[PDB]
Amino acid sequence: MIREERLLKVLRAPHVSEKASTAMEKSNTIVLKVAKDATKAEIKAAVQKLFEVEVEVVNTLVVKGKVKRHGQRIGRRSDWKKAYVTLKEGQNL
Amino acid sequence: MKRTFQPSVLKRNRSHGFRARMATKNGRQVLARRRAKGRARLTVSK
Amino acid sequence: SRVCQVTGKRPVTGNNRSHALNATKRRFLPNLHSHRFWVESEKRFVTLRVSAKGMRVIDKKGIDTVLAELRARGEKY
Amino acid sequence: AAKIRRDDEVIVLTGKDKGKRGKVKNVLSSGKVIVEGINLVKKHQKPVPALNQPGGIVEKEAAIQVSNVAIFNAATGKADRVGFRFEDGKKVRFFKSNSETI
Amino acid sequence: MKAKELREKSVEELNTELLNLLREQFNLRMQAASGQLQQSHLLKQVRRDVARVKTLLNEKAGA
Amino acid sequence: XXXXXXXXXXXXXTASFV
RNA sequence: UAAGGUGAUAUGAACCGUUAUAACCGGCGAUUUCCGAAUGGGGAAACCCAGUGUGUUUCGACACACUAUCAUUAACUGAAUCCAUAGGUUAAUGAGGCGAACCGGGGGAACUGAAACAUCUAAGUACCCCGAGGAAAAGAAAUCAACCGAGAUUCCCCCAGUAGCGGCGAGCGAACGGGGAGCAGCCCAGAGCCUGAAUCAGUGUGUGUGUUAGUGGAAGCGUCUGGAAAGGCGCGCGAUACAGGGUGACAGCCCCGUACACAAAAAUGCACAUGCUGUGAGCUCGAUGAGUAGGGCGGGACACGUGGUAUCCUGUCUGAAUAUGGGGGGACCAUCCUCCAAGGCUAAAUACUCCUGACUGACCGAUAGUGAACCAGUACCGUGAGGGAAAGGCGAAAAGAAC
RNA sequence: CGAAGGUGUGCUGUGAGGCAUGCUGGAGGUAUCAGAAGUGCGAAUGCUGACAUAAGUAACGAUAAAGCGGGUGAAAAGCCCGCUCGCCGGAAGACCAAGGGUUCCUGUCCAACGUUAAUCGGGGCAGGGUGAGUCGACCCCUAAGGCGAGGCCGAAAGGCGUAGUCGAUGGGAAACAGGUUAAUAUUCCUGUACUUGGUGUUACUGCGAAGGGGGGACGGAGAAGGCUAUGUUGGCCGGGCG
RNA sequence: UACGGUGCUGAAGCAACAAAUGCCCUGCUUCCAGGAAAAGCCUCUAAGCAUCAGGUAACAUCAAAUCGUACCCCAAACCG
Ligand SMILES: Nc1ncnc2c1ncn2[C@@H]1O[C@H](COP(=O)(O)OP(=O)(O)OP(=O)(O)O)[C@@H](O)[C@H]1O
Ligand SMILES: Nc1ncnc2c1ncn2[C@@H]1O[C@H](COP(=O)(O)OP(=O)(O)OP(=O)(O)O)[C@@H](O)[C@H]1O
Ligand SMILES: [Mg+2]
Ligand SMILES: [Mg+2]
Ligand SMILES: [Mg+2]
Ligand SMILES: [Mg+2]
Ligand SMILES: [Mg+2]
Ligand SMILES: [Mg+2]
Ligand SMILES: [Mg+2]
Ligand SMILES: [Mg+2]
Ligand SMILES: [Mg+2]
Ligand SMILES: [Mg+2]
Ligand SMILES: [Mg+2]
Ligand SMILES: [Mg+2]
Ligand SMILES: [Mg+2]
Ligand SMILES: [Mg+2]
Ligand SMILES: [Mg+2]
Ligand SMILES: [Mg+2]
Ligand SMILES: [Mg+2]
Ligand SMILES: [Mg+2]
Ligand SMILES: [Mg+2]
Ligand SMILES: [Mg+2]
Ligand SMILES: [Mg+2]
Ligand SMILES: [Mg+2]
Ligand SMILES: [Mg+2]
Ligand SMILES: [Mg+2]
Ligand SMILES: [Mg+2]
Ligand SMILES: [Mg+2]
Ligand SMILES: [Mg+2]
Ligand SMILES: [Mg+2]
Ligand SMILES: [Mg+2]
Ligand SMILES: [Mg+2]
Ligand SMILES: [Mg+2]
Ligand SMILES: [Mg+2]
Ligand SMILES: [Mg+2]
Ligand SMILES: [Mg+2]
Ligand SMILES: [Mg+2]
Ligand SMILES: [Mg+2]
Ligand SMILES: [Mg+2]
Ligand SMILES: [Mg+2]
Ligand SMILES: [Mg+2]
Numbered sequence A: 001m002i003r004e005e006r007l008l009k010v011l012r013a014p015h016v017s018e019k020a021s022t023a024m025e026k027s028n029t030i031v032l033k034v035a036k037d038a039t040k041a042e043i044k045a046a047v048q049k050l051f052e053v054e055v056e057v058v059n060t061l062v063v064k065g066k067v068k069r070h071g072q073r074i075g076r077r078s079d080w081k082k083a084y085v086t087l088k089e090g091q092n093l
Numbered sequence B: 001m002k003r004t005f006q007p008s009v010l011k012r013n014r015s016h017g018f019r020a021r022m023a024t025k026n027g028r029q030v031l032a033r034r035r036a037k038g039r040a041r042l043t044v045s046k
Numbered sequence C: 001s002r003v004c005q006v007t008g009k010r011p012v013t014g015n016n017r018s019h020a021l022n023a024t025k026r027r028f029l030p031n032l033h034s035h036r037f038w039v040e041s042e043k044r045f046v047t048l049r050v051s052a053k054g055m056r057v058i059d060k061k062g063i064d065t066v067l068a069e070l071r072a073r074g075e076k077y
Numbered sequence D: 001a002a003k004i005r006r007d008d009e010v011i012v013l014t015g016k017d018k019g020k021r022g023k024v025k026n027v028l029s030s031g032k033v034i035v036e037g038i039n040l041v042k043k044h045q046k047p048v049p050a051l052n053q054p055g056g057i058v059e060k061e062a063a064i065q066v067s068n069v070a071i072f073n074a075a076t077g078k079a080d081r082v083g084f085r086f087e088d089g090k091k092v093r094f095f096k097s098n099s100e101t102i
Numbered sequence E: 001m002k003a004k005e006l007r008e009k010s011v012e013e014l015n016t017e018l019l020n021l022l023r024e025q026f027n028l029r030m031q032a033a034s035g036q037l038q039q040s041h042l043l044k045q046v047r048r049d050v051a052r053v054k055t056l057l058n059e060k061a062g063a
Numbered sequence F: 001x002x003x004x005x006x007x008x009x010x011x012x013x014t015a016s017f018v
Numbered sequence G: 001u002a003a004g005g006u007g008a009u010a011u012g013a014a015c016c017g018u019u020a021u022a023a024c025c026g027g028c029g030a031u032u033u034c035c036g037a038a039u040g041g042g043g044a045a046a047c048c049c050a051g052u053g054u055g056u057u058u059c060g061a062c063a064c065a066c067u068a069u070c071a072u073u074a075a076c077u078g079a080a081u082c083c084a085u086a087g088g089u090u091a092a093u094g095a096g097g098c099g100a101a102c103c104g105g106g107g108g109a110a111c112u113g114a115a116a117c118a119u120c121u122a123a124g125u126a127c128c129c130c131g132a133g134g135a136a137a138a139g140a141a142a143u144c145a146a147c148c149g150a151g152a153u154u155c156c157c158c159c160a161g162u163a164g165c166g167g168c169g170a171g172c173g174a175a176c177g178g179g180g181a182g183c184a185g186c187c188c189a190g191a192g193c194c195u196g197a198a199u200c201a202g203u204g205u206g207u208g209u210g211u212u213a214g215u216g217g218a219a220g221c222g223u224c225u226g227g228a229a230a231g232g233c234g235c236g237c238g239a240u241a242c243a244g245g246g247u248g249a250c251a252g253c254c255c256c257g258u259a260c261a262c263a264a265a266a267a268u269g270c271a272c273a274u275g276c277u278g279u280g281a282g283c284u285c286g287a288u289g290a291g292u293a294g295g296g297c298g299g300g301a302c303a304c305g306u307g308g309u310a311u312c313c314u315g316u317c318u319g320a321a322u323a324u325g326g327g328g329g330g331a332c333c334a335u336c337c338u339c340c341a342a343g344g345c346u347a348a349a350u351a352c353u354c355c356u357g358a359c360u361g362a363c364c365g366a367u368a369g370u371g372a373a374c375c376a377g378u379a380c381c382g383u384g385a386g387g388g389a390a391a392g393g394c395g396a397a398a399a400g401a402a403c
Numbered sequence H: 001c002g003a004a005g006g007u008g009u010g011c012u013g014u015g016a017g018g019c020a021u022g023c024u025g026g027a028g029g030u031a032u033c034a035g036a037a038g039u040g041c042g043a044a045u046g047c048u049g050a051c052a053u054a055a056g057u058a059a060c061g062a063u064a065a066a067g068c069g070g071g072u073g074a075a076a077a078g079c080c081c082g083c084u085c086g087c088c089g090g091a092a093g094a095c096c097a098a099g100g101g102u103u104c105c106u107g108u109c110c111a112a113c114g115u116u117a118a119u120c121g122g123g124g125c126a127g128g129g130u131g132a133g134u135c136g137a138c139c140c141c142u143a144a145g146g147c148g149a150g151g152c153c154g155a156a157a158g159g160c161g162u163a164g165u166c167g168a169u170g171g172g173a174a175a176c177a178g179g180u181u182a183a184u185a186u187u188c189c190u191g192u193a194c195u196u197g198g199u200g201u202u203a204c205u206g207c208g209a210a211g212g213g214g215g216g217a218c219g220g221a222g223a224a225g226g227c228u229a230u231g232u233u234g235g236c237c238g239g240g241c242g
Numbered sequence I: 001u002a003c004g005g006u007g008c009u010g011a012a013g014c015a016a017c018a019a020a021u022g023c024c025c026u027g028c029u030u031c032c033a034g035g036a037a038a039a040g041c042c043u044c045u046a047a048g049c050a051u052c053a054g055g056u057a058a059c060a061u062c063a064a065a066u067c068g069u070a071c072c073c074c075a076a077a078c079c080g
C-alpha cells in the first residue's frame, strides 16, 4: 500500500456503464477495474495519491467471466475485480 | 425416484480430488497413467 | 521386520510339498529373539533382535567385534 | 540473400502477361511479388459504409510467383539470371550474362 | 544507443527514469481505455523500455 | 448438431413349460 | 543474416526498419505468478494462515531474506543416575520426485496344453515392489578337460532337438568341443629397502576434429497447341550439380536446393599433447579370507520333477582341515590330473529407444495409416478407475460473385 | 489434338474377360514378359455410413380452461397491453442450503433449438448486472474419523499408533428500520446503533503458565401459567349516498 | 410528463378481545434407557518481573483484511 510501484499497476481502466454514470450524478462514487489480486486498502491509497482526491470507503466485487463461443469453439472471459470508490463530499473528478 | 448420483462438491473433492489421489502411490499411479495418456483434466478438481 | 541384525537373515519363500507332490507357496522365517547383550566396555546392556544362529556367532566373534561391523553397516543398534 | 528486391525492374516470364515489363511494389513472404500495374484483376468490392462507401468494379494488382519473373537487364533488353559476388566484402548481385555488378 | 546510455549512468538516475517511464504507461493505459489514444504503438514501446531499463539495473547491480 | 445413440435392453416374458 | 517485419485461424488498425540496434536464427546470460517431490504450518491442487530477522516510516504499515523431513558429520547443552548414555538445540553436506523400453534383485498367478485332471505344462511368463547405468549384470578359475592340453566374463553360429529330464505322458532340453565378434588384467587380507617413479582421477593450457547459427554455388532461347508451357517441334549449353521439391500441364539450364567449396564472437562434446593437485610404481621377505567348507532336516536353483544324483543357494540344527593342507573330476572309493572358496575392483564385443538429425521403402492414402492427416486423448460417456468418436480435398490466383 | 474414374453403345472370346468408340471428367496412365501380394464378397442376428419400409399412420407429456378487444409485425389461438373466466393457495406462494453456473436485466434477430406457428423464450448475438467491521464462508475451538515426527510392527510396498495436526453436521464479538436500480441490496444512500483488537494520553495499580478451578455443558416425556407474532371487533381518519 | 414516473403535500395512526407448534423454557415436574468435547470467557496462583513490564478505568484514535453474494432452488435452471 505504501510502495509507489505497487500502486501504479493496481488501476486498470474506468468503467463507463449506465450504473457508473448514475454513480457520478448521485453518490460521487467512481467505478474502476482493478487488478484481480488487489485489496481495498492499496486501491484507496493509489487513487488518493494519483488523483489528489479524498476517499471515504472502497467496496470491491469480483466479476466472473462469461462463457462464449467463437465459431464452434468454447471460450471463457477473464475474471476481473470491480471497485466502488466513494469520494469525500465536494470533490469532483 | 431418487437416482444414484447425488452431487456434493466437498464429498466429490475429498473422494477423487487431486490431494486425495496423490496421498497414496496407487492414486499417484492413476495420475501417471492419465499424464501418459495426455488427459486434459488430470483430476476432478476444478 | 523379521530381519536378523547380525547375519542379515530375512524371510524366504518355498513350497509345501505333499505326498502327492502338490506345491503351495510358504515362507521360512528366521528364529529371531530379542536378547540383551552385556557389552563390558560401555558397562551397558544393548538390546538386539538376533536369530539363534546369530547368537552362536556372537560367542565366536566377541560382542565388541560384531558391533564394530554393525557401525560400518549403519544398522543403528 | 534475396534475388528480387523491392525496386528491381523485372520482366514476366510466364502467364497471360508474358514479355511485359514492370517495377516490383511488394515482396510477400509467400514467394510472390506485386508489380505496378501488370497483373490487373477486377475485384467485385462490396460497399463498406464505414469507409470507402461507393463499391464498384475495382482493378488492382494480383500477386505473381517470383519464379515467373526475371530481372530486366535494361542494357541487352532481355531477361537475365542473378548471381552473387563479394566485391569489397559486401555481397552484391550481378547478371549472369556479361557478369557486370548491378 | 539506449542500452548503452542506461548503463553509463548510475542507479539513482535510472530509478527516476523508471518511475517517469512507468507514469506515461499508466497514462497511456487510461487514454487507451477512454478511447482518446490514437497512437497505439507507444503502449508496446514503453513496455519494452521498462523491461530494458530493469535489465540494465540487474546487470549493473553486480549480479 | 451432436446426435448420438444408446441401447441397454431388458429381458422378461412368460413361461414355455407346458 | 537482412529489405523488409509485428507467431495461427485472419483480416484490419497503429507502426518499426531499408546497409545496419527492423524482424528472424544460434550461443551465453536476466526475469520466471500460482500449483505440483512442495520444503514455514494447513488444505477440498492452482488456496487459507503464519513465525523469525534485517531494512524502510508518511506511524496506516511496507519490502526482502530465512524457517519441511530424513541421512551423514561436527559442535553446544543434556535425564532417570556419580561420571556417562539416551535425549535436545544449532551448522554444514547428500537425498526426496519425474521419466519410454532395456537391466539386476525381492515377491509371483491363472486361463491353457495334457483332448478330464492333481505331478508337470503355461512360467519364473503377466503383474506388484526396490534399485541403477548409458548400458546394466557378469567377470580374472577352489574353471574345464582327460594322461594331450586349454586358460576371466559376455555375445553370435554350430554341436542338437543330441545326451538326458518327464503321470518316461504332454512336454522340457543341455554340456563338452569347434568356428566367430571382442579381448585386460589388478588390489587388500603386511612390513621393510628404495622412492613418487608407472598409472588413475581431478583441474586449468594449447593443438586437432566435431556440434549449436550459417555462406556461395554452373548452364535456354525460338516457334506450335493452350486459360496458363515446364508439353510438341527446332537449334544450343552446364554437369564432381540429371538427389529431390516448387513454379498456371511433364523443367539439368525459372526458383529453392544438390554436388561441391567454405564459415564461429561465444558456449560445448571428443581425442591427443602438456602443466599442477592428489594417486602410488619396483625389489626382498612374509602372509594365504572359520561359525566358513562339509553334514542332518525342509525347500529352491542347475535341461536334470528324489531318482543310484554329483555341483550351486540356505530357513533350521551342527560343524572341520587350514599348504606337512584343502576343492573338483555327475552316487561312492582308490589312483592320477587340475585348481586354491569362505575379501574386493575392472573397458570392449551385448540389450533397448521417451528424444534429436539425415535418409530409405515391390509400406498406407482418409471405413486405410497412430485412437487422432482436421485445435484428439478433444467432444461425449461414466461417482471413479476408465472408455472414447466423427470430421481432409473450390480455383493457378478469392480474383469468394459490384450492381 | 484429353489420362484415371464415371456413364452409354458397338464388337469380341469356351469362361473369368478383352478391344474401340460417343458423353462427363479433368491428369495422369502404362505395352510386353517376369516378380510380390492386405488378389476377387451376397450371405457370418457381419462392421461403419447413406437411404427405404411401416407412414403422412402413432404420438405432440397429467381432463386446472380458456375468451375477447386493441397493439406490434410479412404473417398472431400461442407474444405485449386491457377486460372477463377458471386453477393453486401448508402451494402450483415467498426466502434459503445443497447442487447448478450467467439460466438474471436490456436491446436486437428467427437458421437451428421449443414435439405446431412464433414477432416470443430459460434459443442465437451484443452490452449491462452480485458492493458486507456487524450475512455466510474464512479465522479461534473441538466430535466421529482421517493423517501422523519419533516409535512398534511387517519380504518390499506398507499396517497401526504417541506427541501433535487436521476435520462441522455442533461451541465461539457485533445492525436495525426506511428509501432507491431494467437487473444488487441486513452488502447502496439517509437516520439511529453496536462489537473486537492496535496505538496514544491521563489516573489508579500485582502482573504473570503448555498449570488449577469454575463456566461453557447438553436426555426423553408431560403439565400448565405469563407473553408476543398474528387475527377479529369497536373507535378514529379519508372516501362513498350506489 | 415518455401509459412509466417525477416533485410537493399528506389525515387518523388508538383500545378491547382472541391467540400459537413462536418466547419466558438450556425452566419446572416426572421417568429410566441415565442423556458430547474443546476453546472463547471468569478466576487462582508458579518460574520470570516486581522503578519496569503488565493489569484496571476514562478519553482520543486507527483497524476490521480476503472469499461467497446475480438467478433457479419440490424445479423448464438440481439428480432422472
Ligand atoms: N599358503 C598358500 N596359500 C595359498 N596359495 C598358496 C599357498 N602356498 C602356495 N600357494 C600356491 O601354490 C603354489 C605353490 O605350491 P606349494 O605350496 O607346494 O609351494 P610353496 O613354496 O609353499 O609356495 P611359495 O613359493 O609361493 O612360497 C603357488 O601358486 C602358490 O601361489
Ligand atoms: N535397410 C535400409 N534401410 C533404410 N535405408 C537404407 C537401407 N539400405 C540402404 N539404405 C539407404 O541406402 C543408402 C546407402 O546406399 P549405398 O551406400 O549402397 O549407395 P552407393 O551409391 O552404392 O554409394 P557408394 O558406392 O559410395 O557405396 C543409406 O544412406 C540409406 O539411406
Ligand atoms: Mg466483498
Ligand atoms: Mg544461399
Ligand atoms: Mg508451502
Ligand atoms: Mg503440508
Ligand atoms: Mg477449513
Ligand atoms: Mg530450509
Ligand atoms: Mg514413483
Ligand atoms: Mg485341459
Ligand atoms: Mg545416471
Ligand atoms: Mg563345496
Ligand atoms: Mg565329488
Ligand atoms: Mg583361500
Ligand atoms: Mg475419398
Ligand atoms: Mg482414421
Ligand atoms: Mg481380401
Ligand atoms: Mg458389398
Ligand atoms: Mg456364399
Ligand atoms: Mg432378429
Ligand atoms: Mg450383410
Ligand atoms: Mg461420412
Ligand atoms: Mg394429420
Ligand atoms: Mg396403419
Ligand atoms: Mg389412425
Ligand atoms: Mg390420434
Ligand atoms: Mg401439454
Ligand atoms: Mg386475440
Ligand atoms: Mg414465419
Ligand atoms: Mg379454487
Ligand atoms: Mg391456510
Ligand atoms: Mg391441502
Ligand atoms: Mg451456489
Ligand atoms: Mg447462453
Ligand atoms: Mg429473462
Ligand atoms: Mg419449430
Ligand atoms: Mg438467451
Ligand atoms: Mg514413520
Ligand atoms: Mg455449521
Ligand atoms: Mg457501506
Ligand atoms: Mg398485540
Ligand SMILES: [Mg+2]
Pocket: I021
Ligand atoms: Mg410438536
Ligand SMILES: [Mg+2]
Pocket: none
Ligand atoms: Mg439475492
Ligand SMILES: [Mg+2]
Pocket: none
Ligand atoms: Mg430478485
Ligand SMILES: [Mg+2]
Pocket: none
Ligand atoms: Mg419436472
